[PDB]
């Protein structure tokens, strides 16, 4: 009765680590569906373009999908060209780049998680590195191999190469291991950069830990109370407009906030410790 | 009791991304039914027409089906020839093309999702590119092949070609990889164009984010309250007409809105920030 | 309790697209039962008649079945020869052809859906095109074939033809692909004609979108209220007639509408915007 | 609770098309039991009689079974020889043939549905057409066959014929396809005749669509109210007769309708628009 409610406190408080763990399980299961069912490397001069598109084109699609599902990217830009100075204010002219950096860094998580699982399953790199045709990086792969390594390297994936197939089986192990080292150098350097920018944003905060915990509680249910006020004032307005249409009556006046009050409550909020307001709707009510 | 109600808030708020994800799962499962069960490429001079019809004719059918299921295409055109100046108003003469651009762009989503899954499963392009018979684009496919590649290329799908079947197996890999590169160039450029026009429509909006959130709440249940008023005034009218038919009585008068009020409430709505009305039914009640 | 009621709103509002999707699933499953279990092509001079009857005779039966199940075809014709001028009125003498065009076009949907699934499964066309015996259209099928293609083409379905069975297997692929191109040319041109006549009927309507939505709500439950009035006046009439038969009594009079009022309420309804009546029963009550 | 009641309206309104679809499913499943388990063609001079009895004798039995289960054939004939002029009235002397045509045409549906499924499964026609022994119709089957087709055709079903069994396998395909063409010519011409006589009976009706819908509602529950009056007056009569037998009492009189009133209420009903009566029991109560 209340024991199951006691463990739903544990699955709602740690909700930012279940969401990032369900994103990793979807990225792993989607890469194994592309490499098994759809990917089959040719053995042509189009090896470089074919393997480098299966690596970077699903990363470009996941980046654009992060801009659609980000709710604070639409709060920033909706109605921008009416007056752009409400997004570029006079006191804090560089807060627009701080907010825009947060949308960009938050939507760069699922692209990086794609590039790491695709490099730890080294089939896309093996196809792309075969057709390299470069002066450097070709002596490193073919070091103690016969002389037909510099011409027929791009056929090592499909088989069907006349250079003694115990040599072909160890050229597919030297390329499958170069990709898995790059897959760990990307996980290790993106985890360190992610902690270094989160720790810098908290160390440079204007409030301490206890006031920031109240600020997050207020902003969470200013959103819930705003959905119930919109849903209450729109039932009273639609009931008024329908009775005066069918009965041909003149309506009683309906008081709504003006246009200057709607646009002032939609600005960008920056904290000031002299007068502590926790939203921009809190600020226009207290100041008038 | 209320825990399952708490997660139906999560499956009703994100309803525009479950609908677009269920459309992609139906398009993938329908392309695998056509390519496995029905598609079998001939090896004739009709290769070009056969493969290019299985690509573009299910895209033409899905485009017409998007015009039928679009509710705002019927609100725009019903009763057009009575007076066309209610669709071409005097102040905003170019809003008719802005609305018509929204029906066209919204119904172009399922055609593009068909053309991408059909190109990532490269059977329709392999049949169509075989019978090309062009001066260009035929030297690119047959580069280091024997001289019977320029005459018997259209038989490479069915087998039964006398050009050493290790050469036929790598002409089917060079065409199956050219189609999968075009399948990713279409997903990447349609995702970028879809974000560029949505961001331009929000940046050029007349209202800010908070007033647009109230406008969407009002328009959603002006539709629910209109279905309950129509259902209430049609029960009272059918009860009146049936008692005066069987009993041979003369009826009491039933007040309804006139024809000039029905047609004025069906016009096209454009926001004005001087007098803020949230529908065209709100405007004819307040103005008279 | 009310959550399942909330999704039955979604399965009752979109009821005209579940009915047309269940008709397509029955037509596909019925064509696979005829082509697998019953159809087996002979190899005689009766190839043309045998395959062209399995194509067009189930389309003729589905057209006649659409006239039986159309409720508005019986409302138009019942009691026609009593006075034909109630179906050919004086003001609108061409509305009879507009209504008769709607019964004909609505019952032509299941014949066209039969002819498309039968042509996309190319067994009926392969049997019928084999026995063509025409000067044209026989050189197009036999282009680079031996000279026994002009005489023994009608045996290519059954096998047992002495023209090198790798040639017989590619004459069955050139005919199975000509039928699937015609199956897509019929789906594409019937979808475009279906949208062009629906859009012309809405653009030429006498009322706008909002008045047409009330008109459909009234006509739906004038039918429900008429079934409850007939069921109420027939219980009171059968109770009266049975008590005066067994007890040998004389009955009290039972007031019913006259014959001139029954026939005037059964005419064909055309909207007029000067006096807006939503049925022909609404018109004879208000006018007398 | 009421949702399942809402769909039983759909399975009771369309009750005349579920009954005709369950008759077709029983006729198909009964023909496959006769042709698989019981039918085995001899190869004698009795081929013509054996196959033509399995075709027409189950059609004769299904026709007689339609006269037993027709309730309006017993209402017409019961008590005929008491006075035949109540079935041959003076004003409408040709209504007796119109009613008798309705019993005959309604009971001719299951015979025609037997003859069509038996001809679409061409085993009964193949046995019967083999032993034809006619001057015509024997040159059409044996056109380009050896000379032992005119003498040993009746053995082609059982096998065991010395005319090169690739010729016997294509004489069994030319007869199995002649029967399936006749099976579609019977379905197509009986569907067209069934619509042509129903449309002529409705176009020549005395009442319009709305008065005919009330007439069908009254006749349906004059039958239900008559079963409850018979069941109520027979409980009161059997209680009276049993108390006066065991107690040796004299009974109180029980008023019943006379013999002239029982026979007048059992006549044949024809509508008159001058005095509109909806049954013959309605007419003898109002007229006396
Ligand atoms: C990369 C994501 C970085 C991130 O979201 O940092 C936010 C949060 C730290 O702040 P707080 O919510 O714990 O107060 O971090 C966390 O609470 C834990 C995030 C754990 C991310 C990996 C989980 C598989
Ligand atoms: C349950 C998962 C949804 C969720 O709670 O999102 C929370 C998290 C936002 O956290 P933050 O931006 O405040 O640090 O956003 C995320 O962690 C993103 C998770 C997205 C998972 C999508 C899986 C289809
Ligand atoms: C894969 C894409 C993941 C993604 O875009 O996450 C971004 C967003 C976090 O930003 P915010 O909404 O918390 O401000 O996370 C979300 O809010 C996404 C919530 C909805 C996810 C879909 C659920 C079916
Ligand atoms: C200027 C950028 C500063 C910044 O974005 O840090 C703030 C953010 C923590 O979230 P929040 O406490 O501001 O709600 O931290 C993040 O959103 C960082 C996301 C993780 C970056 C992953 C890059 C691979
Ligand atoms: C292509 C569809 C583009 C689109 O519908 O954009 C609308 C919406 C952005 O506006 P909003 O509803 O989030 O306020 O976009 C979204 O909310 C997310 C749409 C996600 C589409 C892909 C999901 C698989
Ligand atoms: C549940 C899916 C239905 C649904 O909610 O449609 C919502 C969406 C309309 O969103 P928008 O036009 O306001 O951006 O329209 C769509 O996203 C289209 C989805 C159509 C899915 C059809 C699947 C058979
Ligand atoms: C595949 C076709 C998808 C499609 O046409 O979506 C268009 C429409 C979105 O437009 P709108 O109705 O929101 O104005 O989406 C809809 O409203 C479709 C809702 C009904 C879908 C059928 C459900 C069985
Ligand atoms: C002029 C066109 C401007 C436009 O259509 O953008 C508006 C629309 C967003 O929906 P809404 O906020 O207007 O309800 O955005 C869309 O409907 C865009 C749909 C996605 C286009 C896909 C094309 C491949
Ligand atoms: C998203 C794109 C996935 C996709 O299109 O897979 C296509 C795949 C092609 O198989 P193949 O004949 O190319 O080996 O077809 C299949 O074999 C079926 C797998 C489809 C994915 C399962 C869901
Ligand atoms: C062919 C059928 C054409 C048709 O019935 O059009 C009627 C309707 C359009 O009018 P409305 O009911 O949407 O207001 O169309 C629709 O609502 C959608 C019909 C969808 C037909 C194909 C569904 C598989
Ligand atoms: C549930 C399907 C029955 C149904 O609702 O019929 C509705 C539709 C009539 O729509 P409309 O003529 O008003 O455009 O008529 C149709 O769409 C015809 C569907 C017939 C399906 C028969 C399947 C055995
Ligand atoms: C296959 C034949 C389909 C067909 O004839 O549909 C016609 C009819 C639509 O016309 P209407 O009755 O809406 O005026 O649709 C119907 O009303 C048919 C409803 C009854 C279908 C049988 C259900 C078991
Ligand atoms: C003169 C014909 C005009 C016409 O029939 O269009 C009206 C009708 C739409 O239904 P409704 O709005 O009149 O109830 O639309 C239809 O019934 C068209 C049915 C689809 C035609 C399919 C032909 C392959
Ligand atoms: C929509 C059109 C689908 C369709 O017509 O498939 C026909 C298919 C033809 O098989 P085949 O003999 O041509 O290999 O017949 C089949 O093999 C059965 C598959 C039917 C699709 C399953 C539902
Ligand atoms: C052969 C049967 C002919 C027949 O019974 O016609 C009667 C009826 C037409 O009158 P109504 O009952 O629709 O007003 O027809 C119908 O309602 C539909 C009969 C459908 C018969 C075939 C169903 C598989
Ligand atoms: C449930 C089926 C019984 C039924 O309702 O019979 C109705 C129908 C009579 O209709 P009608 O003569 O008034 O046109 O009569 C018929 O359609 C005959 C159906 C007989 C089915 C027998 C199956 C063993
Ligand atoms: C009704 C008449 C059906 C009947 O009599 O079938 C008899 C059948 C004769 O088998 P066979 O030895 O003649 O091949 O005996 C059987 O093989 C058993 C089948 C009986 C039908 C199943 C019920
Ligand atoms: C096979 C025979 C079918 C048949 O004879 O149908 C005739 C009859 C229709 O006539 P009517 O009773 O409606 O006047 O239909 C019926 O009324 C038959 C109803 C009883 C059927 C038996 C049910 C187990
Ligand atoms: C003189 C014959 C006129 C006639 O029988 O038509 C009337 C009848 C329709 O039934 P009902 O409306 O009279 O109850 O329609 C039928 O009963 C016709 C039955 C179908 C005939 C099938 C023949 C293969
Ligand atoms: C509707 C008409 C269907 C029909 O009559 O099928 C007959 C079929 C004939 O089999 P065959 O011996 O001619 O290969 O007999 C069968 O093999 C059984 C299939 C019957 C259909 C299943 C329901």
Author numbering:
A (entry chain A), B (entry chain K), C (entry chain J), D (entry chain I): 1 to 288
From the primary publication:
To further investigate the CALHM channels, we purified human CALHM5 and determined its structure by cryo-electron microscopy (cryo-EM). CALHM5 assembles as an undecamer, showing an overall truncated cone-shaped architecture, with approximate dimensions of 95 Å in height spanning the cell membrane, 125 Å in extracellular width, and 145 Å in intracellular width. Each subunit consists of a large transmembrane domain (TMD) that comprises four transmembrane helices TM1–4 and an N-terminal helix (NTH), an intracellular C-terminal domain (CTD) consisting of three α-helices CH1–3 and an extracellular loop region. CALHM5 exhibits an unusually large pore along the symmetric axis which is broad at both entrances with a measured diameter of ~60 Å and is slightly narrowed down at constriction.
We determined the structures of CALHM5 in the presence of EDTA, Ca2+ or rubidium red (RUR) at overall resolutions of 2.89 Å, 2.90 Å, and 2.64 Å, respectively. However, these regions are well defined in the CALHM5 structure, where TM1 is poised parallel to the central axis of symmetry and the preceding NTH projects toward the axis forming a constriction. We observed extra amorphous density in the middle of the CALHM5 channel and five lipid-like densities per CALHM5 monomer annotated as PA1–5. PA1 is oriented upwards, with headgroups toward positively charged residues at the short extracellular loop. PA2–5 are oriented in the opposite direction within a cavity formed by intracellular halves of TM2–4, where a network of hydrogen bonds and salt bridges holds these lipid phosphates in place. But in our investigated structure of CALHM5, PA1’s hydrophilic head forms hydrogen bonds with surrounding residues including Arg32 of TM1, Asn121 of TM3, and Val37 of TM1′ (apostrophe indicates the adjacent subunit), whereas the hydrophobic tails fill the gap between two adjacent TM1 helices. Interestingly, we noticed that these residues are not conserved among CALHMs and some of them, such as Asn121 and Arg32 (Arg124 and Glu37 in CALHM2), are also involved in RUR binding in CALHM2.
